Amino acid sequence: MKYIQTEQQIEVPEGVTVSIKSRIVKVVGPRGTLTKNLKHIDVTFTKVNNQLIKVAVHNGGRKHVAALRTVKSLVDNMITGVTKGYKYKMRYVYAHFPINVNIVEKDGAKFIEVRNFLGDKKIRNVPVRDGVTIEFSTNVKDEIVLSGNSVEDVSQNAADLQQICRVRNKDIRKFLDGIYVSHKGFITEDL
Amino acid sequence: AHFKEYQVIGRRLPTESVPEPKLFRMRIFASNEVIAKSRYWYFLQKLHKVKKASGEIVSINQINEAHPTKVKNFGVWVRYDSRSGTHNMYKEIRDVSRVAAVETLYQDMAARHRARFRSIHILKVAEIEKTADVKRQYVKQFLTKDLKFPLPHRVQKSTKTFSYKRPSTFY
Amino acid sequence: TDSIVKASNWRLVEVGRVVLIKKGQSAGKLAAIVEIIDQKKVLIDGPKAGVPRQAINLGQVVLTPLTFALPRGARTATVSKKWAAAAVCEKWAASSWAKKIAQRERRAALTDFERFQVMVLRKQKRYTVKKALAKA
Amino acid sequence: VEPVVVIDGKGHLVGRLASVVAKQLLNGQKIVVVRAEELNISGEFFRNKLKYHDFLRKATAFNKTRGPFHFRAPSRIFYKALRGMVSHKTARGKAALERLKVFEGIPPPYDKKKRVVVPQALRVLRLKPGRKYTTLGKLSTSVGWKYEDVVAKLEAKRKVSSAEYYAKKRAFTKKVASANATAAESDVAKQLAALGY
Amino acid sequence: PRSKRSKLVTLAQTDKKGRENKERIFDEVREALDTYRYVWVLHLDDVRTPVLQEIRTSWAGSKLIMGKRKVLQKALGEKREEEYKENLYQLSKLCSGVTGLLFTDEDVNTVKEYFKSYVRSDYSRPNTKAPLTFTIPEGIVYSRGGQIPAEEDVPMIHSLEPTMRNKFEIPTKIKAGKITIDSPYLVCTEGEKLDVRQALILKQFGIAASEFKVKVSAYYDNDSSTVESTNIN
RNA sequence: GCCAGCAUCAGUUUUGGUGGCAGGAUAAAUCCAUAGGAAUGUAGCUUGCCUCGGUAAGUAUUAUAGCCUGUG
RNA sequence: AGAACUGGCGAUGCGGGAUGAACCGAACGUAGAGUUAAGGUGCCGGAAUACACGCUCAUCAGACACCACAAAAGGUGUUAGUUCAUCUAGACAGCCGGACGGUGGCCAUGGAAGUCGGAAUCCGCUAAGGAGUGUGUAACAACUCACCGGCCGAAUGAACUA
RNA sequence: GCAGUCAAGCGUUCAUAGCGACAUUGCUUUUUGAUUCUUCGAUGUCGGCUCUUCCUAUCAUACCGAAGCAGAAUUCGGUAA
RNA sequence: UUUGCUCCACACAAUAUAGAUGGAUACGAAUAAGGCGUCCUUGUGGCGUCGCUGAACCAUAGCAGGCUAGCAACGGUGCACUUGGCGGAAAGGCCUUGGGUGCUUGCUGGCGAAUUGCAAUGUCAUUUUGCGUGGGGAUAAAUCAUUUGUAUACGACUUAGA
Ligand SMILES: [Mg+2]
Ligand SMILES: [Mg+2]
Ligand SMILES: [Mg+2]
Ligand SMILES: [Mg+2]
Ligand SMILES: [Mg+2]
Ligand SMILES: [Mg+2]
Ligand SMILES: [Mg+2]
Ligand SMILES: [Mg+2]
Ligand SMILES: [Mg+2]
Ligand SMILES: [Mg+2]
Ligand SMILES: [Mg+2]
Ligand SMILES: [Mg+2]
């Protein structure tokens, strides 16, 4: 129908600042600083007061209107990351061969080394992305914690750590081995 | 074309045992009087047993708009022939004149349903007097209090085949 | 420590926006928006410039950065009274856009003898300008 | 009106530019096109790459050295469109094509000259916002051109030098404007203003 | 075809009730106020059908309406210039919850002292606080979950471990034949905000630490045309 | 003898400027007068309000803006 | 493989359909000027990168009669309509609570309690709740759905047409 | 292919004038894996040697998906010349 | 090889030539954004202004631009010399120093022009030499023939010898 005006609304909390010049967003908060390059959407941002941003599309179709809410969700995830953080927890299970997972520094680059997955002689190497921190949670057996400000980087690093050790040419109703995400939450889990 | 509106009043031929036959009037949207009288005889032959050589045209007049500068909302009832069958439709057009609304409807039917002039009947044109009697959302979204919108990405045509600075689409 | 969002400023088509007509019978003259018909078409009226009340495409005009208070759908005597009360012709004449328009048509109306005079005075001004430069 | 017209090819559409350059050449005007790696084609990168592969598939089957020749530079892709739009088998078309020069980047002596644009071939004026487009340097690199980093390094060097030149000329323009505005409100300035200058 | 969400497939026996049920409830409320002289506005918030089919059995003499709240307020005509009695707008604006209307005729202190008694036990009180702190031990978990005797219980079924872990965030394995969580994990504690997860865990471990008791807002006599307020919490 | 230029005309044709009339609802409009009305509700007044009068919702047919319809 | 009427080619150039006996326009002494037919006006190529309202994005789009062939059907691609419904007595989506009692209805079964099967399909209390829509257990449990209620506050759902 | 029961569209709004997609049963037993020594073959202007390309409608090799797929070995699909 | 060569100058004869006739007049990036000016802590900053086309900007008066006399300024500009830098993508060009010397329409005066006859491009910028005259300087190789065999149908290839 080509609606005349469509708007979404972003509520920004107290201790954080946002700076948007030409569809390039910078969020500065109590945990760091995140940035994003939104120069493929054709939207307009407007500051109402110092606590509300409003994003709008004028004379947009259906495919164009469907991107306002994804812009709002991306900027809200930036705000949520810089004020709470993202914490993913991964648990790894085995039947016979215990998996040894360690953090290494191969020419100063912070890899995860996985070895003895299903008795393999192969060493699997997965690089830590920039900004995500990996810890090994004591008092829980066979668990890893990934923490960061960027939900995209934290989730992508947990995803390729999941995908590096998959079962090949076997029966997956019988061979229950590998690493799985068990919880996605926040570093500051409340308040 | 650019249409006009005519009233056409016709009649049978007076004869023995039928003196003073009944007069019938129609409102035809057409671009000239020849097409106006042809459309009159088309509709009268479909509705009665009268031919063009059985009857005669009594009067042909052109109707102008009463208030040509006043933006009105029109509801138009039409029927048309598609490739499979024939259907009735209701549409809404916001414009200043009945002939203007009829022109926009003919363009809209050609653009949206590939219906030519020869397969469209205008059943009725009427003005919707009150708001909250407007069914179409594409018309309703212009009846809002204090309506404002911009025009982003202004494109200007030029001459001279060459420019000496990069253009700017600001507005 | 305040947030900063700049990103835009736009001229709006709305009731009361005055408008320069770029092509047609009434080219070069000002009118006002009195009603919005659709996304592409509006109803305009300018009584003082001498343009009739009519519907047009927005592609035949250009919006100016001038506006005044006007109710929706106001008739011609009303738009005349509000136009002269809000005094938009003087602000339009004080704009730098209209001065460039008048400068263009004044340069077009010149004769051969006035072109010769323009050349002589340009040389006389260039002398003192170039002498006042480089010894500042 | 100029003896040679130099066109900056950044941000133009390929066929809409080639049409107007072909007409200018046949009418008798000398054209130099620079920055041919920055041109655009409407449509997705994958679709344009598949079109180039359909072109790449055609060759003379009994001797591949006789066939259509597939040139990989962006300047040569532009030249192929232009040669399609003139009648190059005649002497008139040959002379028209010899009135033209196409380069990647801005080599000497054209880096000290003025570059123009063609507004009816510009992508921001012609394409609807939201449509996808392809960049010619990326398309030619994917099909086999091998000088995309050399040209980028040379273009960075040229941009540094022209930024110095512009800083100098902008300061000079500032002092000339200040010297001109102090000779206004003079009698000959008022006479010139009345005559319209 | 346009991209739209299609509804889920269910082919069952019940059908959806309409405005006729609301109209019948409104007519019943007006006729019940006309027939019974002791209309009491009560607030039965969190209650199981078993407990109500008991109070409806104890006061087997009066009438109880438990319809929609806005429909009941419309039947009592909560408009300031509308009524079916004299000045029932106070008793109409009193309703602010999952309201109930107990229309009686018998008493006016007995029907306000027995209620102060009926107060049986209930589930884990998902909105309020809980008292009995429970911590499951570091062994195989069982059905009563440290609320029965040693060998007088059944070990927990294998088909609930995925709900125990991926829907209550309790660390668990299987590792021999049963649930058998490795450490001892305390679910709830005394005098704290019991969460939805804690309340669902206490319900699945089948504990009953909160009490249900009726709360009567007001009671209006139609003979004197007057409503007395109460706070029988 | 060869090749041209200008003026005044005739025949054919193409492209501008301007004047006088006729018709139609003896254009329909705008504009002026007058009766009725409404809301995408102006003044006024009243309110959980009240950033110290900003806004919000309720009355009110022109008032400290206007509009619509009929008749002339 | 054969007939009927008319128009053509053969016997015929010219403008157009890129190209062609038969299609469209038009039939021909040698020239000049003007106007057109059919067909066209980004460039090849003479002539508007005219004006106006819409639709369409194709990982073999589509682009002009003869003539260089493809529907019903399927699409969670988009556009416009038609007929039914629901909705401030609060509709659709989401969160949360209820989801009861004769009764573990009757046969079959080593055991099957709504959920391996055959029969069946009732009654009460209800605001509503199936002699059960699925997951589940050896069988029970537990969860979900059908159906009602609280919170939030504006239009929403189905089938069909092109 | 023949015969019968259906039943969404239908006979451009009729169900049963008259169609009728998706289904569904019947009919074709040396009817309890039995007999059948059978290649019940087709082919008359082509066949063979030598040699080169192209198609994909994929046999093998590469990578994936499903299956009561324990392992091993297979089967059915997708991309791919 | 009857004075052959290099580099720089013209007496004279010429060559027009896909087509001179005031000037090809240098940021980069974005377009749902920028340019310019100003202010301060120096920013994704505050304030102001501009755009809606180069229809601009610079240049432009004098016999195709002559001969002279003054005023006012310390400017503009041509022409060779000169001091330095910079430029490698195809640099082959750009900036600058300091003196000579010409012009100046910034302003004011004095002479001259005709007959090309009422128009006829009415010839005005740019080039490579040639006949030897004019000034310094520079003194070579290749092929055939003879020979080799890392090569070979023949040519070609690869070696040796004043
Ligand atoms: Mg004449
Ligand atoms: Mg008149
Ligand atoms: Mg013959
Ligand atoms: Mg013939
Ligand atoms: Mg013929
Ligand atoms: Mg022909
Ligand atoms: Mg053809
Ligand atoms: Mg002729
Ligand atoms: Mg042309
Ligand atoms: Mg395949
Ligand atoms: Mg296997
Ligand atoms: Mg191969």
Beta bridge partners of A58: A5
The whole domain housing A75 covers 1-85
H helix and E strand count, chain D: 8, 5
Name the residue among B49, B26, B22 with its Cα closest to residue B38: B26
A3 contact B CB<8A: yes
Same domain, A37 and A103: no
Same domain, A92 and A185: yes
Give the number of other Cβ atoms within 10 Å of residue C108's Cβ: 8
Contact call for residues A151 and A77 (beta carbons, < 8 A): yes
CATH code of the domain containing A145: 3.90.930.12
Same domain, A104 and A185: yes
Alpha-carbon separation of residue E114 from C126, E91, E105 (angstroms): 110, 22, 15
With beta carbons under 8 A apart, name residues in chain C contacting A26.
none
Contact call for residues E216 and E233 (beta carbons, < 8 A): no
Domain ranges of chain D: 1-147, 148-197
Length of chain A: 191
Q: Considering only residues 58-87 of chain B, list those whose CB is below 7 Å from strand F.
A: 61-70
Please indicate whether the domains covering B2-68 and B69-145 agree at the CATH topology level: yes
Q: Tell me how far the alpha carbon of residue E103 lies from the centroid of ligand 4, in angstroms.
A: 111
- CA–C1' distance A152–I145 (Å)? 86
Same domain, A41 and A97: no
Alpha-carbon separation of residue D45 from C82, D40, D42, D80, D132 (angstroms): 56, 10, 9, 19, 8
Quickly name the fold that domain D1-147 has: Ribosomal Protein L13p; Chain: A; (3.90.1180)
- CA–C1' distance D114–I87 (Å)? 19
Quoted resolution (Å)? 2.6
CA dihedral E103, E106, E107, E110 (to 10 degrees): -90
Query: Tokens standing for A180?
Result: 């799985």
Alpha-carbon separation of residue E193 from E46, E134, E197 (angstroms): 17, 15, 11
Name the residue among B128, B80, B83, B125 with its Cα closest to residue B104: B125
Query: Tokens standing for D7?
Result: 């066109």
Query: Tokens standing for D110?
Result: 């054209």
Distance in angstroms (rounded) separating the CA atoms of residues D121 and D81:
14
E171 contact A CB<8A: yes
CB contact under 8 A, D119 and B153: no
Give the number of other Cβ atoms within 10 Å of residue B105's Cβ: 22
Name the residue among A158, A172, A85, A170 with its Cα closest to residue A126: A158
Alpha-carbon separation of residue D70 from D58, D66, D74, D80, D144 (angstroms): 9, 12, 12, 10, 10
Residue D178 CB partners (closer than 8 Å, separation 6+): none
Name the residue among B23, B22, B28, B10 with its Cα closest to residue B102: B28
Contact call for residues E202 and E66 (beta carbons, < 8 A): no
How big is chain B by its Cα radius of gyration, in Å? 22
Quick one: CA dihedral E101, E107, E109, E114, positive or negative? negative
Of the options 1.10.150.20, 3.40.50.2300, 3.10.20.10, 3.10.20.600, the CATH number for the domain spanning B69-145: 3.10.20.10
Most B CBs within 10 Å: which of C6, C8, C34, C37, as the mutation test of the B interface?
C37
A138 contact E CB<8A: no
Same domain, A161 and A102: yes
Same domain, A154 and A61: no
Distance in angstroms (rounded) separating the CA atoms of residues E192 and E212:
19
Contact call for residues A142 and A161 (beta carbons, < 8 A): no
Beta bridge partners of A104: A111
Chains A+C touching (3+ CB pairs under 8 Å): yes
Helix or strand holding residue E3 (H, E): none
User: Which chains would you list as touching C if contact means 3+ CB atom pairs under 8 Å?
Assistant: A, B, D
Contact call for residues A88 and A155 (beta carbons, < 8 A): yes
Of the options 3.90.660.10, 3.50.50.60, 3.30.590.20, 1.20.5.4280, the CATH number for the domain spanning D148-197: 1.20.5.4280
Say how many CB pairs under 8 Å bridge B and D. Answer: 27
Distance in angstroms (rounded) separating the CA atoms of residues A160 and A153:
11
With beta carbons under 8 A apart, name residues in chain C contacting D182.
132
Distance in angstroms (rounded) separating the CA atoms of residues B93 and B112:
15
Please indicate the experimental technique that yielded this structure.
cryo-EM
Q: Classify residue E148 as left (phi > 0), alpha (psi -120 to 50) or beta.
A: beta
Same domain, A39 and A93: no
Domain ranges of chain B: 2-68, 69-145
Among chain B, residues having any CB pair with chain D shorter than 8 Å are: 153, 155, 158, 161-167, 169
Distance in angstroms (rounded) separating the CA atoms of residues B151 and D22:
35
Distance in angstroms (rounded) separating the CA atoms of residues D99 and D121:
21
Last residue of a domain, one of A19, A51, A85: A85
Distance in angstroms (rounded) separating the CA atoms of residues A84 and A186:
6
Task: State the total domains in chain A.
Answer: 2
With beta carbons under 8 A apart, name residues in chain C contacting B151.
10-11, 13, 58, 63
Same domain, A94 and A148: yes
Strands (E), chain D: 4-8, 30-34, 40-42, 100-102, 133-135
Same domain, A20 and A73: yes
Same domain, A169 and A91: yes
Residue B35 CB partners (closer than 8 Å, separation 6+): none
Chains C+E touching (3+ CB pairs under 8 Å): no
Q: Which residue of C has its CA nearest to A60?
A: C39
Query: Tokens standing for D184?
Result: 């206004």
Distance in angstroms (rounded) separating the CA atoms of residues A145 and C34:
64
Is the N-terminal amide bond of D3 cis, ω within 30° of 0?
no
CA closest to C1' of G99 belongs to E49
Nucleotide whose C1' lies closest to the alpha carbon of residue D57: H54
User: In CATH, what class is B2-68?
Assistant: alpha beta
Same domain, A53 and A93: no
Contact call for residues E172 and E181 (beta carbons, < 8 A): yes
Instruction: Name the phi and psi angles at A8, rounded to 5.
Output: -120, 165
Same domain, A101 and A130: yes
Beta bridge partners of C30: C20
Residue B99 CB partners (closer than 8 Å, separation 6+): B2, B3, B4, B5, B29, B65
